[PDB]
Amino acid sequence: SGFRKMAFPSGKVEGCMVQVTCGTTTLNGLWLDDVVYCPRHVICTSEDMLNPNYEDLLIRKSNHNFLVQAGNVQLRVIGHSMQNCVLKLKVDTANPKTPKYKFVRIQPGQTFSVLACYNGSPSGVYQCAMRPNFTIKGSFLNGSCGSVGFNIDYDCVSFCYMHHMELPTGVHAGTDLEGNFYGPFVDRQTAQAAGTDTTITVNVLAWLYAAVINGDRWFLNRFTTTLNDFNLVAMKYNYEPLTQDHVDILGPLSAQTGIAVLDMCASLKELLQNGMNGRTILGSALLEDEFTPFDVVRQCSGVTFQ
Amino acid sequence: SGFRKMAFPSGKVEGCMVQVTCGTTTLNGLWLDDVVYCPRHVICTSEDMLNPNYEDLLIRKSNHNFLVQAGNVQLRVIGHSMQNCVLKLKVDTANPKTPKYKFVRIQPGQTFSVLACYNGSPSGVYQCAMRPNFTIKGSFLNGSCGSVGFNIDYDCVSFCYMHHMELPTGVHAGTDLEGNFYGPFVDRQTAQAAGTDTTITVNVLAWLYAAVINGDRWFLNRFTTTLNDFNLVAMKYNYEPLTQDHVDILGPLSAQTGIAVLDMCASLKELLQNGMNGRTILGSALLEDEFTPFDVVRQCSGVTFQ
Ligand SMILES: *[C@@H](CC(=O)OC)C(=O)N(c1cncc(Cl)c1)c1cccc(-c2cccc(Cl)c2)c1
Ligand SMILES: *[C@@H](CC(=O)OC)C(=O)N(c1cncc(Cl)c1)c1cccc(-c2cccc(Cl)c2)c1
């Protein structure tokens, strides 16, 4: 038992991380087969990052302008191209540590692990959710650009996030690995800002089921509610609507605990209207929304990856 | 910016994890050079784990009674011995993935990363603190015995924990890698229980400094307090005493934020006596005590490992 914010084992991704330097800008790249992927703003200087024309900036570059270091070994760049907001650097060596992988784009509300990196060297691993407003609440300092987010399914790494920038509220924005930003953000320095977020209702319900599996039951009750009646309450507290698909997805957790989904909604309703009255759930005094139903099943059942 | 419960990158440990089977019991082992380390209760059956005589149980075993699998490759056991509560299985192959490592024993209040494993296959990574009562609040299911805890310093893995058992309150107990239990626990089935815990005061102060570094300041005030006066309050709220060494250790964080340590103690005093009045700190509505001053400096400054 127990319930932790648990990341995927990071080894398969550690073996892909490299350092990319262009001019005085150094950041991280992702080395898969004979290509290194990195944020295209590596080619920008201080004054460039104001209002850049990336096509113009890149035609002025040569292969030799990109220094790629994999550990203490230099990788010769033999080609380069832009794909949306990422650079693809062709190198003359295929990464022998390339895992089986996919490039997937995730949905707001889904979770992933982040391998934070500096100078091509991994620093730490943590779990993130993509917020409804397409930001992530990460932990990133200068030099972390190019760090990636991912999930692992058996032996295959599904890369879903490349870090690009920090927004003024201290949250983070980036792209999928095709270089397409998550949300209405751009790789230039503007006054862009996050804008309004909501709480991921299906995940809160998942986490309440995790709590019951782990012996926290004080918030349960005999009442039930209808889906429409619950969604009236969710709207009032800035929770996003619950759908019948969400109810279906919560089916297994409902069957394991014996608590009907709509019954757990009544409990969430009460928790929203009354607070927690000085008690905790799974060691938290807030309603936690960064665990998906899959995350709860994985952790409270125990799936591994090889 | 941002602040997350961040684990060390797990790759160096993933390459050491193996499956150890004796009879019908399967758990995890740690393969370093030509030795596999695992909990000695792998040699016990259901009825054995009641009141076992491990010396008696082990003399009845042969090398061939221990099946060790590293992935899909079987390791031939050529010797075996007991060391306190761990088994050391000599195998005929040195692990080519052995990192530089040390066996260290940590103090209550210190943190480490856990690589949870099942059947020798890594499942997830998370950060843990050793509680004052020598338990850890982990996330472990059946089959997780033998999973290890560790820290990484540059390139060297300091192993500090091997998982053995879950206590009745759902918290976890284990040994250092010399096989000596943390706390007053034994590898037999008794009515043993955790017993009383306290909150790690120096870590809460560290985390308040992390909050200030990250822009949360609402809990600051103009008041100060003396060390003795603060410690009177800490005792009342089940916090452990703060020492002058703790104050010294908080020196760098104090100098970076410009907030005297004793001033932050006054803030903690107010937070204990008034609660948080519906506000949060670093996304928590509770005072967090599982970040050390080192953890805060590492994350809010950005040290990597290679
Ligand atoms: C990358 C900066 C770089 O290329 O060299 C250090 C970087 O990690 N940046 C960052 C990311 N996350 C958090 C923090 Cl505090 C910094 C970063 C630094 C400076 C500018 C930018 C940036 C600005 C506008 C648009 C974009 Cl896409 C990036 C990012
Ligand atoms: C290990 C059990 C094993 O050898 O085969 C599965 C195991 O991981 N156990 C465990 C650990 N953490 C959480 C949970 Cl829910 C289970 C475990 C299972 C059964 C018994 C014991 C045990 C009992 C008394 C003493 C000791 Cl040292 C271990 C652990």
Curated annotation (Swiss-Prot), chains A, B:
It is found in: Host cytoplasm; Host Golgi apparatus; Host nucleus. The active site is at residues 41, 145. Residues 1-306 are cytoplasmic. Inhibited by pyridone-containing alpha-ketoamides compounds 13a and 13b. In turn, alpha-ketoamide 13b (tert-butyl (1-((S)-1-(((S)-4-(benzylamino)-3,4-dioxo-1-((S)-2-oxopyrrolidin-3-yl)butan-2-yl)amino)-3-cyclopropyl-1-oxopropan-2-yl)-2-oxo-1,2-dihydropyridin-3-yl)carbamate) inhibits SARS-CoV-2 replication in human lung cells. Inhibited ex vivo by michael acceptor inhibitor N3. Inhibited ex vivo by compound 11a and 11b. There is a cross-link at residues 5, 90 (Glycyl lysine isopeptide (Lys-Gly) (interchain with G-Cter in ubiquitin)). It catalyses: TSAVLQ-|-SGFRK-NH2 and SGVTFQ-|-GKFKK the two peptides corresponding to the two self-cleavage sites of the SARS 3C-like proteinase are the two most reactive peptide substrates. The enzyme exhibits a strong preference for substrates containing Gln at P1 position and Leu at P2 position. 3CL-PRO exists as monomer and homodimer. Only the homodimer shows catalytic activity. Interacts with host FBXO22; this interaction promotes the proteasomal degradation of nsp5. Cleaves the C-terminus of replicase polyprotein at 11 sites. Recognizes substrates containing the core sequence [ILMVF]-Q-|-[SGACN]. Cleaves and inactivates human TRMT1, preventing tRNA guanine(26)-dimethylation of tRNAs. May cleave human NLRP1 in lung epithelial cells, thereby activating the NLRP1 inflammasome pathway. May cleave human GSDMD, triggering alternative GSDME-mediated epithelial cell death upon activation of the NLRP1 inflammasome, which may enhance the release interleukins 1B, 6, 16 and 18. Also able to bind an ADP-ribose-1''-phosphate (ADRP). This is 3C-like proteinase nsp5. It comes from Severe acute respiratory syndrome coronavirus 2. The chain holds residues 3264 to 3569 of 7096 of the full protein.
